[PDB]
């Protein structure tokens, strides 16, 4: 199965900061990567599909890019509601392996 | 396999065939996304890329420009029903709302199920290889409308990926939007196996179908939906085999002629073709093209069947006494002919013709007497009628003779019906 | 937009069998599949299994192979997940999600409120 | 569209179809100039260019080596006439003087009109791309018979241009010089559009034909003229649609059976098929393959038509009283079957079979009574006979019921012990 | 050529045709060796070579998954016999011992004769180009599973050699293992010419066959044997023309409608089709597709023939007085139609329809009188019936009129014609 | 070889309409088209228009669009060119020539003797 | 439309001189160029078709060459009857644009 | 394995005609061809001719064209070679061998014991 | 016809020696070369077919190699029974031309 490694594991940022999250596939998965937002105690929310297409109702500040084995989630201006754990998921193989997740925390 | 020769009627009945009956159609819509090829232009004259590109635009433009004899009664009705049903479903699919929904349905995946406004559920599959390549390669490669680039690998790549698309358009154009079969370009082996796996049938039926993937293709057909933007949309009707492995048999017959006082009293059973039992009912398939054999399995289309009473089997047991109206044909004219069966052949040998049987090892073995004779594939390898040689089957199986007085010997010497057609056994007597 | 309502939190003793429900609403259930994902406390998202509501076919990861039984009632649009041979370490939130109809993978666009399962 | 159900004869008449009638053939001669490939030789062994070149010489060499049932009476006669007419014209074209004249005619242009010695005017079109390329490229590139040159672009270009030529030869070789249809290789979409524009017809007919460019291909055919030096000559017969948009209708019928004292008085209209009015005359098309639908338009070949008196329409109005001989079949055996119509279906349901109607949304809705019943596509989505499910049409239109008495009920099966075929009503009574 | 118009029966007999009769089948087994493609793997992602290679593995994998009216009586029997005979021979070939022997037989040569366990001798031909090229070039090129190599010449070469193999698999897959004809991919022109040269026939027959190589392809067919390791095995049945150049003739007829006491009862000879003398016997070919013309030569399949007595020719001489039972029909319904013959046309014109003949030079020349009229291709260029124009043949030959009073004048004494169909004249008398 | 005979010189007043004739001879008129070309004194050759004698279709350059009406009598093999809204500047020699039958261009191999038109 | 420019416009030559006339197409027209001879007061006469094929009855001293955009008419030995205006014409597009013409005059 | 038995040594006077026999055994004669090869003393192997036992077709080298007549009796599985216009220099060992059935060449896998022909 | 030239013509070797015999085709014959062993007074015996495939019952000490024009017969360990004349034969053309032969003689 394709192992999915997210980096970094935790990132501390302030409101308005540009946030960048990376996801690495062990083998080429073209553009079949999905991104989910999972706030603690809340159900996961899909953010990006097919590496770059913004989901309906997702604020335009979220953008997805990349192809093949390396994919990156970029937040143009972090809002208070964006502090959550983010998980990437490959939608290339049947197993749909999830990333270990990236926690976005408030910068002290 | 068991073949029984019926001396009573100069006919043979072959039992042991299994049934593979098409009970429905599974509608699969495919969206071949070509991409924004219209904005690509070549201003540096003739070039390899331009040649394929111009052909591609030509193909896309061309596609925009396109959008009581049982056997005589039934032949094509199933075919007409298949096409008509597809066309009825196609009209539903042609609605802009459904195309928009399907495109949206496939926005996030390569395969999704959508329910049409007419309520039919259809399996939609996305083909994206071409749109990816062109956009992520060809489009870019083409810099400032210059197409004669030295990177021959780009040109070769483009010619390779468009091969399927050009073939699909060619088949529909040459077939005016309705193809007679499902080529490899319409649905690859991988696509077909996946589509079959989603069919609403039992695991046993699926397994049988997976082993005979090639037969499934031959009974299906494709219909062009239309061109919506940069995506070509077409539909494929896959046969649903809802009934499998049910006792089938085939009846073959030859002219039974008896000669009294030089006169000829001939009788020919026209109830020939495939018959299968299903849920205790007997289904008759009168048209040649509706049933095809593969070993012990006979593939017949249920839409081509005509339900007949169970008593019709009595015509193979006691046609002379049965109350069932076994329909046959007669004629004061004798016809000498060979009717090849799966396990043998009926040899009708009458006045004026020389008949003999032979083998590849011995040549002519013995002359055959006048009348209807049944020859097993063990007694000889070949049958010869005058100068006409018929090659015998090499299938293995059991042969039995059901002795009986020929019905033709029970004609009316005082008066024999002449050249009867679409009549019954009683009418002949 | 479709909604998913999961059962409430359950506390069970080790070795018992638990059955979790997932009720679908506001969408044509029979046109999709249900995927099950769990989150162990302090761990990431783990795939539990998938069931096609159209064909009923199931697939499971190796750690759940033979342990999970999935059912999908198209008449009530309600999925159920039954996890056998529960251990203390299986205490986690199990989420049901709208998965693909077929073999093609897709992102999960509808999520249940989640069910806390305590062993 | 208007569909009328006739309880009088368990048949339906569907009106509102438009006529697209083929009235003639337009002879188009094409000269595919291959060039002086014979003098090209490869002496440096196997190479990519040699492989295509040897195939080309082989293809060129190979081409040198090739050079009163109304429906049963008419079926194929139109097809035979089309081929025969083309062959008759081809023999005229085969004269060396005409080949020389055409070659001279095309010396100064790519398209010219030539009058054959037999007086027929034919439109000639020249294809020069291959002759140019080879001479101005391949020929030169091949220096001192060396073909394994490092310029792979040359080899790829050659393989690209010869694709059409190899396909043309392949289709004629595989079809022994007479193809069943006009593939894209025989005549491209651009060539066809140009040819159509020069046809001797009204502007309205041309417009209709330009919109249906894809349909024209299916009724035409190509014939190989022969090989004259380095030029391959073939002829394409394009259908001339001299009559368009004339009232057409289709008649469909099912067995009308009446069970009297167990005996079944069955009646079957043999006058099924397409009928069109033209200049006050009624043209009947009895063969299945001679008429094809596209929406409201039915494409029929006038060469397949048999003129029938206007009174033949009376069989749809008062067949029981009309003096016109409405040829129909009458037997004792009942046949249960579904006859799908454009706006519905005839359901013949008699003793011994279970019939029901259903919808894709509700499933089984209601059981049908015994006898001939007409079911609209609005009352149900599907019809089920025993285990056989027939998918109903989704075409929109008006439905009317013309109440009356089946002539079958008039027949007394107890007093009618005769299985007859196409015997009108005189024999039935 | 000599065409005789028979006023007595409103029919024409055309003599002088030569016979090219298929008397047998020559079984040729081909072994297309693909090689050890299974062990080739591409680990460097998508590449041009990988695309063809994956397709090749897919194609190879896919192939593993596939493995009383005379004319109505005979139609398809010959075709069924051809397939059945091939299948009977195919089962013999499927024995592992025979495949092993053939493979051993072809170990030391490209062509050898092997005797099957069933005793049939078959000619085996080896195709090795693909196996050698891949092993000597492509296999070495793929180093350490890397397929995206810069040597584009290798990729182009691979795509060129696999073209035949992919086409062979495509045709069998699309035809479910039984192709309708022998394409150039199944047997090239060089292979066919060599195969023909080994046929057990006289030098004269071989010569005729070599000139008509293209006709041989159309009557043959190919059958897939199966996949045994890295070699694809299929069989081709070539037609054996054991009888050539024997007197053939064709009979055509049109309805002889005679108005008698308000009865337009018509007499139509149904004995239409091809007839050939062979060893003093007369062979009748009733099915349209079994005989095809090429000049004076008519290619007919002896397996489709039905032997008829020599006296059947008397129907063309003195049908009204001969003791032979001639095949005709007796229906009151008047039928106006054109029956195009090789050297002219029969024009059945009756009250109600307008009939005229015309030329391109004069237009309408004269109106034709009611009844059966024969028009030579010299008297006019075209025949017009109402609005229907029929193009006349331009074949050259002799025309003769055999005067006689129409039998139809006395065929029905206005005595219950009973719209008889396919009946003897005596029944109507 | 075919021959073309044009009408004699004509002098007309400004604004009038002139009709010029072109008689074809010694060739099968119905198998070709007629192209019209003029030469203004001191200027080059200018295309005026074309008519297909087989189909009757016409095409005209923008300066003659709507001003010229072309007819082709196949029975007499005579072409006629009618130029409307004549101006003083239209005084020129108008030549008729055997043009292409169809959309494929061809060189003009037969020319008329020319007609001097004076406005 | 394709503009056709002839060069030179006028050429003075003596009998026997080698005359060269050039014609330029604004875009590629392959070999679809025609040449016409137009003597004063006489109708134009076609000289060359398809850039290089000599018309029937044209003296062999006339020869045509060139392809693509640039085409050249060459007279191997100018005769007294050759002093006339020459016009090139493209036979590639529907408009069949004529060149402005080249006048061949007797060299003083 | 098949065997080939050739006739015994022959001595003939110049200009005579000699007929050499070649009997095949232990193999299906009718499925192969017979090739003839000779060895002149002190010289190499020279091809003499070939006959197909299936079709009877023959081919000969230029020095033997018209001089040699080959026949193949399938009933007795025996080949015969008749060499005409013998010269003193034709004294050599003539060998018959199992040749190809058809036009495809093959190695000769069965050989006769050889026949010494003395002129 | 393709001329076949063997080299060397004669080779003297001892038992156990490695023997190498070459055969040259005048044009490429791919791999269609055959090798025959011809002992004096004995009938010729086929050794190798298709340039490298060992014939049934031939000792494994015999091996064949080469392709195109130049082909080579190699004996890994010469035995007393191997002293004979060897002839190569092309099986590419209809004439099946033989080589002049190579005599293997006992080394003195
Ligand atoms: C078509 O475009 C894709 C995407 O740009 C190319 O694939 C890239 O190849 C490069 C160079 O080796 C890599 O660094 C990338 O990782 C690849 N990206 C992707 C998305 O696969 C591909 O090579 C192009 N094809 C051609 C023929 O130019
Ligand atoms: C495949 O490999 C063969 C063998 O190396 C190539 O054949 C050679 O071609 C060259 C160049 O013309 C010659 O000099 C040699 O004599 C050939 N050798 C042999 C053994 O035939 C061949 O060209 C290659 N072809 C492909 C399609 O890759």
Structure description:
- The complex is a heterononamer, with three copies of chain A (108 residues), three copies of chain B (429 residues) and three copies of chain C (119 residues).
- Chain A contains no helices and ten strands.
- By secondary structure, chain A is mainly β.
- The termini of chain A are far apart.
- Chain B is of the alpha+beta class.
- Chain B folds into two domains: 203 residues, no CATH class; 191 residues, Helix Hairpins, CATH 1.10.287.
- Helix content of chain B is 27%, strand content 34%.
- Chain B contains ten helices and 25 strands.
- In chain B, strands 1, 2, 8, 9, 12, 13, 14, 15, 16 and 25 form a ten-stranded mixed sheet that branches. Chain B has a five-stranded mixed sheet with strand order 4-5-3-7-6, sandwiched between helices.
- Chain B starts with a strand and ends with a helix.
- Chain C has a six-stranded mixed sheet, with no helix packed on it.
- Helix content of chain C is 0%, strand content 46%.
- In chain C, a hairpin with a 4-residue loop joins strand 7 and strand 8.
- Chain C is mainly beta.
- Chain C has a single domain, classed as Immunoglobulins (Immunoglobulin-like), CATH 2.60.40.
- Classes of the chains: A mainly beta (108), B alpha+beta (429), C mainly beta (119).
- Chains B and E meet through helix 6, helix 9, strand 17, strand 18 and strand 24 of B and helix 1, helix 2, helix 3, helix 6 and strand 26 of E.
- A molecule of 2 linked components (NAG-NAG) sits at the interface of chains D and E.
- Chains B, D, E: It is a single-pass membrane protein; Single-pass type I membrane protein.
- Chains B, D, E: It comes from human metapneumovirus.
What is the element layout, followed by pairings?
The complex is a heterononamer, with 3 copies of chain A (108 residues), 3 copies of chain B (429 residues) and 3 copies of chain C (119 residues).
Chain A: E1 4-7, E2 10-13, E3 19-25, E4 33-38, E5 45-49, E6 53-54, E7 62-67, E8 70-75, E9 85-90, E10 102-106
Parallel strand pairs in A: 2-10
Antiparallel strand pairs in A: 1-3, 3-8, 4-5, 4-9, 5-6, 7-8, 9-10
Chain B: E1 2-6, E2 11-22, E3 24-33, H1 48-66, H2 70-74, H3 77-93, H4 96-105, E4 111-115, E5 121-127, H5 129-141, H6 152-174, H7 189-197, H8 203-211, H9 213-219, E6 221-228, E7 231-240, E8 243-244, E9 248-253, E10 256-260, E11 263-269, E12 273-278, E13 281-285, E14 291-294, E15 297-301, E16 306-308, E17 328-331, E18 337-341, E19 344-349, E20 355-359, E21 363-367, E22 371-376, E23 382-385, E24 388-391, E25 398-402, H10 425-428
Parallel strand pairs in B: 1-25, 2-15, 3-5
Antiparallel strand pairs in B: 1-2, 2-8, 2-9, 3-7, 4-5, 6-7, 9-12, 10-11, 11-17, 12-13, 13-16, 14-15, 18-19, 19-22, 20-21, 20-23, 23-24
Chain C: E1 3-6, E2 10-11, E3 18-25, E4 33-39, E5 45-52, E6 58-59, E7 68-73, E8 78-83, E9 92-99, E10 115-118
Parallel strand pairs in C: 2-10
Antiparallel strand pairs in C: 1-3, 3-8, 4-5, 4-9, 5-6, 7-8, 9-10
């Amino acid at each position: 199965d394709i192992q999915m490694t997210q980096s970094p594991s935790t990132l501390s940022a302030s409101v308005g900061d540009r946030v960048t999250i990376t996801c690495r596939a062990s083998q080429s998965i073209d553009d079949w990567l999905a991104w989910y937002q999972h706030s603690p105690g809340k159900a996961p929310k899909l953010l990006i599909y097919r590496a770059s297409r913004l989901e309906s109702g997702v604020p335009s500040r979220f953008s997805g890019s990349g192809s093949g084995t390396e994919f990156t989630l970029t937040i143009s201006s972090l809002q208070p509601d964006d502090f959550a754990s983010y998980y990437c998921q490959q939608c290339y193989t049947y197993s749909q392996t999830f990333g270990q997740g990236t926690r976005v925390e408030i910068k002290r | 396999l068991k073949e029984s020769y019926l001396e009573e009627s100069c006919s043979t009945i072959t039992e042991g065939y299994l049934s593979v009956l098409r009970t429905g159609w599974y509608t699969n819509v495919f969206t071949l996304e070509v991409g924004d090829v219209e904005n690509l232009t070549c201003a540096d004259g003739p070039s390899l890329i331009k040649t394929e590109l111009d052909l591609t635009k030509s193909a896309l433009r061309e596609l925009r420009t396109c959008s009581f004899v049982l056997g005589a009664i039934a032949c094509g009705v199933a075919t007409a029903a298949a096409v008509t049903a597809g066309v009825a479903i196609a009209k539903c699919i042609r609605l802009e709302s459904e195309v928009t929904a399907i495109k949206n349905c496939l926005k996030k995946t390569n395969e999704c199920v959508s329910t049409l406004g007419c309520g039919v559920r259809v399996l939609a599959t996305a083909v994206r290889e071409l749109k990816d390549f062109v956009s992520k390669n060809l489009t870019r490669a083409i810099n400032k409308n210059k197409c004669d680039i030295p990177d021959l690998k780009m040109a070769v790549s483009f010619s390779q990926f468009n091969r399927r698309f050009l073939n699909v358009v060619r088949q529909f154009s040459d077939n005016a939007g309705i193809t007679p079969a499902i080529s490899k370009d319409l649905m690859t082996d991988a696509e077909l196996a996946r589509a079959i796996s989603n069919m609403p049938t039992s695991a046993g039926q699926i397994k049988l179908m997976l082993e005979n993937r090639c037969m499934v293709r031959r009974k299906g057909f494709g219909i062009l939906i239309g061109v919506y933007g940069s995506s070509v949309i077409y539909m494929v009707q896959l046969p649903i085999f809802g009934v499998i492995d049910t006792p089938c048999w085939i009846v073959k017959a030859a002219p039974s002629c008896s000669e009294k006082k030089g006169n000829y009293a001939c009788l020919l059973r026209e109830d020939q073709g495939w018959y299968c039992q299903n849920a205790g009912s007997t289904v008759y398939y009168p048209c040649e093209k509706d049933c095809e054999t593969r070993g012990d399995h006979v593939f017949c289309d249920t839409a081509a069947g005509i339900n007949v009473a169970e008593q019709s089997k009595e015509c193979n047991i006691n046609i002379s006494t049965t109350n069932y109206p076994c329909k046959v044909s007669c004629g004061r004219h004798p016809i000498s002919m060979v009717a090849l069966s799966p396990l043998g052949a009926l040899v009708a040998c009458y006045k004026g013709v020389s008949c003999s049987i032979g083998s590849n090892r011995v040549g002519i073995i013995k002359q055959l007497n006048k009348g209807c004779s049944y020859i097993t594939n063990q007694d000889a390898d070949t049958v010869t009628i005058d100068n006409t040689v018929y090659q015998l089957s090499k299938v293995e199986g059991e042969q039995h003779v059901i002795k009986g007085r020929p019905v033709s010997s029970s004609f009316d010497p005082v008066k024999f019906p002449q050249d009867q057609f679409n009549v019954a056994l009683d009418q002949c007597f | 937009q479709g909604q998913l309502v999961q059962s409430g939190p359950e506390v069970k003793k080790p070795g018992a069998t638990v059955k979790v429900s997932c009720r679908a609403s506001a969408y044509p259930f029979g046109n999709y599949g249900i995927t099950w994902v769990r989150q162990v406390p302090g761990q990431g998202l783990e795939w539990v299994g998938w069931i096609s509501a159209y064909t009923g076919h199931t697939k499971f990861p190796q750690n759940f192979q033979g342990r999970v039984t999935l059912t999908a009632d198209t008449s009530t649009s309600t999925g159920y997940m039954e996890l056998r041979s529960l251990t203390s370490d299986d205490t986690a939130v199990y989420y049901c999600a709208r998965g693909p109809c077929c073999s093609s993978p897709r992102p999960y666009d509808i999520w249940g409120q989640g069910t806390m399962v305590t062993v």
